[PDB]
Amino acid sequence: EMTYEQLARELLLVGPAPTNEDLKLRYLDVLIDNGLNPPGPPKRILIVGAGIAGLVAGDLLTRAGHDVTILEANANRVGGRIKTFHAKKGEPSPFADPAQYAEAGAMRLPSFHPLTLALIDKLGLKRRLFFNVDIDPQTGNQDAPVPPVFYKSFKDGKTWTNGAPSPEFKEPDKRNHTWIRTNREQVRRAQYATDPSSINEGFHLTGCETRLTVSDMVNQALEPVRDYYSVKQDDGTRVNKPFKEWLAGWADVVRDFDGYSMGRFLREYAEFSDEAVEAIGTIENMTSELHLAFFHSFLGRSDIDPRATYWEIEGGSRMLPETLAKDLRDQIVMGQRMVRLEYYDPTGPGGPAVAIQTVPEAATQTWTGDLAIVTIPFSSLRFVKVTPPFSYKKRRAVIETHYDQATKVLLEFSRRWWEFTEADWKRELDAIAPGLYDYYQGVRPATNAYGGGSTTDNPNRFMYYPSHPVPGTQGGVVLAAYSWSDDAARWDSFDDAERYGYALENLQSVHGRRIEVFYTGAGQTQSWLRDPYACGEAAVYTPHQMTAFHLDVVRPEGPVYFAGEHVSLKHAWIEGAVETAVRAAIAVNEA
Amino acid sequence: EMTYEQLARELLLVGPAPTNEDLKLRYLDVLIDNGLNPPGPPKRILIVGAGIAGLVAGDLLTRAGHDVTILEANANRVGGRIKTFHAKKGEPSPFADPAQYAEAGAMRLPSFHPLTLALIDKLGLKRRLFFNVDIDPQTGNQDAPVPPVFYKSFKDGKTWTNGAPSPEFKEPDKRNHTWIRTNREQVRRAQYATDPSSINEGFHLTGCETRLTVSDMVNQALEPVRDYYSVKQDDGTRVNKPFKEWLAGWADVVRDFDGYSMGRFLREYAEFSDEAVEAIGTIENMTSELHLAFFHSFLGRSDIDPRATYWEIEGGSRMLPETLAKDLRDQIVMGQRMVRLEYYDPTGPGGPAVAIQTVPEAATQTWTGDLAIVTIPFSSLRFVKVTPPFSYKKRRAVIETHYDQATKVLLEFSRRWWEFTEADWKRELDAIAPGLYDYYQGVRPATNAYGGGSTTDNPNRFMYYPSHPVPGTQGGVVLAAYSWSDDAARWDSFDDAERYGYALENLQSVHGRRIEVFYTGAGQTQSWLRDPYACGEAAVYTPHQMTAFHLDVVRPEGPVYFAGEHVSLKHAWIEGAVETAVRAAIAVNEA
Numbered sequence A, B: 001e002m003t004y005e006q007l008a009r010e011l012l013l014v015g016p017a018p019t020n021e022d023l024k025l026r027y028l029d030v031l032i033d034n035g036l037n038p039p040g041p042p043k044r045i046l047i048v049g050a051g052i053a054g055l056v057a058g059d060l061l062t063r064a065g066h067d068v069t070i071l072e073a074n075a076n077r078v079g080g081r082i083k084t085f086h087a088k089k090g091e092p093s094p095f096a097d098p099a100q101y102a103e104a105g106a107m108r109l110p111s112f113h114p115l116t117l118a119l120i121d122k123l124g125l126k127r128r129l130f131f132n133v134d135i136d137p138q139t140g141n142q143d144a145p146v147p148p149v150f151y152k153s154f155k156d157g158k159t160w161t162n163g164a165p166s167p168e169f170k171e172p173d174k175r176n177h178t179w180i181r182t183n184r185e186q187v188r189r190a191q192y193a194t195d196p197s198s199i200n201e202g203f204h205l206t207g208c209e210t211r212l213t214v215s216d217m218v219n220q221a222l223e224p225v226r227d228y229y230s231v232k233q234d235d236g237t238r239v240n241k242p243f244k245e246w247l248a249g250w251a252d253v254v255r256d257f258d259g260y261s262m263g264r265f266l267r268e269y270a271e272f273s274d275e276a277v278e279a280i281g282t283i284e285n286m287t288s289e290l291h292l293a294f295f296h297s298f299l300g301r302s303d304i305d306p307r308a309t310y311w312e313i314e315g316g317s318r319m320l321p322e323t324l325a326k327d328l329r330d331q332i333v334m335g336q337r338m339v340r341l342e343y344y345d346p347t348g349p350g351g352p353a354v355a356i357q358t359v360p361e362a363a364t365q366t367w368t369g370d371l372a373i374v375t376i377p378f379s380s381l382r383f384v385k386v387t388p389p390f391s392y393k394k395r396r397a398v399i400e401t402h403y404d405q406a407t408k409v410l411l412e413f414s415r416r417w418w419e420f421t422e423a424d425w426k427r428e429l430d431a432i433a434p435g436l437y438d439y440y441q442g443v444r445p446a447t448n449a450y451g452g453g454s455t456t457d458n459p460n461r462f463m464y465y466p467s468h469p470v471p472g473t474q475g476g477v478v479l480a481a482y483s484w485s486d487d488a489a490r491w492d493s494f495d496d497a498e499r500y501g502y503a504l505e506n507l508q509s510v511h512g513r514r515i516e517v518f519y520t521g522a523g524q525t526q527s528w529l530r531d532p533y534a535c536g537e538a539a540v541y542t543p544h545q546m547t548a549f550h551l552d553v554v555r556p557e558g559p560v561y562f563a564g565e566h567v568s569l570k571h572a573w574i575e576g577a578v579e580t581a582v583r584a585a586i587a588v589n590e591a
């Protein structure tokens, strides 16, 4: 009963009654504006894990005078699931062009995630637009300074922002020239949007359902749910109800729908057919999430709203964690994997409150302190021996939280053929050989797309083209394959050469055999399940798990505090890790 | 509506109306007694995959005169998910004792799986009892010949059997001396059976639930379901209702419960608490199956009935597929992975009906024939290009069927310490060093167990001890770790040395630190997800998947027929693969 209101508070970043403070305001205050409240006690803090959560918490707590040590199992790299392939001075380069880079993990940051964007700005880092949908490159004006970060609180005309507006900045126009290739037929997204029957009949859709895009189908199925906490305007836009029944509405969403997977919600509640769910699970999101909890899809990484604006970091996503890491060169210990965690909650009495044993990745090493923030995924925590045991429900959450399997395959091309008009294909193909153009004319139209990506039901699933070229380069690296579960597992068990052949072949199925001429022979692969420090992409709740034990996930265990994407309810997002990191830094500062 | 009756028929091995023949009778007739009906057409048959399904189908169809070729991707091994670690004449031995062997895949065969057991007998192979529960070794009489295989049909006093009874054969008495270690407390199974409160309170169980074993909890939750098709006797044993409403009852089980996961069935229908489900998911089966379909647990690999008897093959489970393979040395082509499947359904007209391209594991190889039986898992089929496309629902089943991740870790010991009394620990520990015994007296009681295994919630989960010693050997190989999902993924990403240390340590948590002295330093690991020809343990349906598309799984596509565990509804069992193999052999014999 109160589980439901407390979960909606955790979900909505609402403080305890009766003040009901906006925690995102507090977090932006701390992280961006002030730093932490005057420390008071200066303490010895052990932070486990140098992903974004540990780096944000450690950078806060250190600047407040505490004695901080960050233990990182990886011997060469910080950032965790933020991972960019790029040329390193020791090693060779990942691609044939040493200037080329590409993402292995996080790649896009939404405008509705203010903590992270503001953090990137405060670190003096540059951001460009990330084109979720492919754009018309002769529209808008990106030369202007990026707009500031804006956040509107749920409260009394309370807003937060980063700086002055930049009215001369204009996003390019969505062009939707990219492909949907399902059931061996293929259309531009613009064609699918106006006549969804072309693709939907391929999934054996009939009746009313056939003439809706899967986006519309999904948004119509959700409108009665949105009604719990909001009213649609005259416009019709949505307006949140006043605070109380806005909060009591969300709490009844949790009560009514947490035992639903997204698929059972679509079949039994929205009354959609098997074929409608199959198409939704193919075009919009993935069939990953249909057996996952309803809440994972209504809040995770999905085509949120064409309304939304996305950003990327110039020079790679790694710039965020690696800049924070340089600020913390004295605190970060690399190559030390926590294998044992010992703590005292009223080591031992009088002495240190926490003791952590690490092992190198010089047989063991013991660390001590007063407080600890554990930010490692539960897939890692599972194999740490903890004494005394955690609370029962916390132990169950470690055992029962699943991580999803995801793999990214990246292919380097010497030219950005996805931008080519058929004219450009003529000019550039023949520039290499006498009649290379005529030699191909397995034939597809020219994609001629800037940004965005294509969707398919072959094992490549989602394909993304780089939003922006690497300055001074002539080619680009395509995210050729981004898939989950059994798809990802089969990707992982290929030899490297087989795997890039398969990814290239499936790319040709969409884009045309002739893309092969621009393939440099350089691929990279990231099998997040093969990563011993992640063992997956993100925490994914199955139905009922969130009310079963998520409140126990966030509770501290004596001197041990917890942070990371899995502690938030923004699973699979950077913003969830940054939120819970600030939240933990505030808490261990308190004592 | 008819989907439900046809699924119950597929489930119950009932032929079409109005004859309603017992297919298991037909399969035992064909496979064991006669061989196939006179062929008629002698044809050219391509079989893909040399697991048990392909070997059973090919051995039948060949002995009926057809021209059969079995294409096997693995370059060194047949049997697929039937895999025994053992000494090979080329390679070194898996363990320090070259006589030692242990299972990587299938290990136990139930008496209620007659096709397989009869097949093992007909191949002149030897079987011993597999002790699911640890036994009193001075009870029963295993010297006598094993009892014959008996099957009672659902029909009119129709029974099948293998041979004459063997009344002098007696199974040993269950002793339940093995451990349950959950929530840092530990009890013998015999103690848990009489006073389940000891373990159940560890899971925070209250009230009525606390005094039930999780087995009782599960069986009581299922009694109203069993009522759909059966009536419990006066005894009370269960008796199946007469045929019609026996079949109409099962069809309403499918209608009423297929949209339930096992967990939602326990929480919402049986009305069990979160803690009761947590304990059930820990002791009885695994928390694997709670988000899987209700039907996967009511039929998969689980503590079925203490009633049941299990068998193992002497010399290893590999003896079954490898004996069939020697009968087929001319038909089996090793090291050829199907990458392309082409077929004609009214190559091309007049010519061959099926064409299969393989690649070596001599750049490509093309095979042709009239009919094909594809027995490879859907995780492999996913990456084969098929032209023309399969039926829509068949393509969706390939995309949407999930395979579960399972890993087995095996540890060799020079002695069978799990059998030791404390006396034997004294005599044998001190036989190695002056006061080795006193040196240890991390202390646990002596296990003193023969067969069966122990259950825990640390990452090892289930631990099994060998039912029988290897004749003329003094030690044994323990299945130290058998786990799924995130547990298995973290097991897989350890170095080999780390992984066996972790498995040994968790074994010591249950059995006592002193087992280390008998550890030879030899481990083996099978990560079924890392296996490119399996990519998992077994097909696992999520809720509603069985009615969504399982009838489409079993349908042929022109000249292409399908077989394997996933085609049956006995997922994760050998018997399901043998059933669908016989079924396919019968069908392609028909033309």
Ligand SMILES: Cc1cc2nc3c(=O)[nH]c(=O)nc-3n(C[C@H](O)[C@H](O)[C@H](O)COP(=O)(O)OP(=O)(O)OC[C@H]3O[C@@H](n4cnc5c(N)ncnc54)[C@H](O)[C@@H]3O)c2cc1C
Binding pocket: A048, A049, A050, A051, A052, A053, A054, A071, A072, A073, A074, A078, A079, A080, A081, A082, A104, A105, A106, A107, A108, A109, A336, A337, A338, A339, A375, A376, A377, A380, A381, A406, A408, A528, A533, A534, A536, A537, A538, A563, A564, A565, A566, A571, A572, A573, A574, A575, A577
């Ligand atoms: C493929 C992919 C794409 C993504 N795309 C996006 C996106 O577009 N936008 C977005 O917002 N988010 C995205 N994310 C999510 C985002 O990257 C993560 O949620 C976030 O980076 C997780 O941060 P964390 O600190 O919680 O965990 P982690 O990054 O996993 O940090 C944990 C750290 O702890 C270390 N560690 C682990 N075990 C131990 C141990 N035993 N001892 C010591 N150290 C240990 C690890 O080495 C690691 O450095 C994506 C994630 C993936 C996998």
Ligand SMILES: Cc1cc2nc3c(=O)[nH]c(=O)nc-3n(C[C@H](O)[C@H](O)[C@H](O)COP(=O)(O)OP(=O)(O)OC[C@H]3O[C@@H](n4cnc5c(N)ncnc54)[C@H](O)[C@@H]3O)c2cc1C
Binding pocket: B048, B049, B050, B051, B052, B053, B054, B071, B072, B073, B074, B078, B079, B080, B081, B082, B104, B105, B106, B107, B108, B109, B336, B337, B338, B339, B375, B376, B377, B380, B381, B406, B408, B528, B533, B534, B536, B537, B538, B563, B564, B565, B566, B571, B572, B573, B574, B575, B577
């Ligand atoms: C850990 C584990 C324990 C088990 N324990 C038991 C048990 O106790 N009792 C029980 O009854 N069952 C058990 N099983 C289940 C049983 O082993 C399987 O269900 C059964 O062996 C599967 O047989 P199959 O022929 O359907 O598939 P497979 O054995 O997988 O056979 C498929 C074959 O096809 C080959 N192949 C794959 N892809 C290609 C390709 N592209 N081209 C060519 N060839 C290809 C593979 O190499 C393999 O040889 C267990 C399974 C596992 C994983």
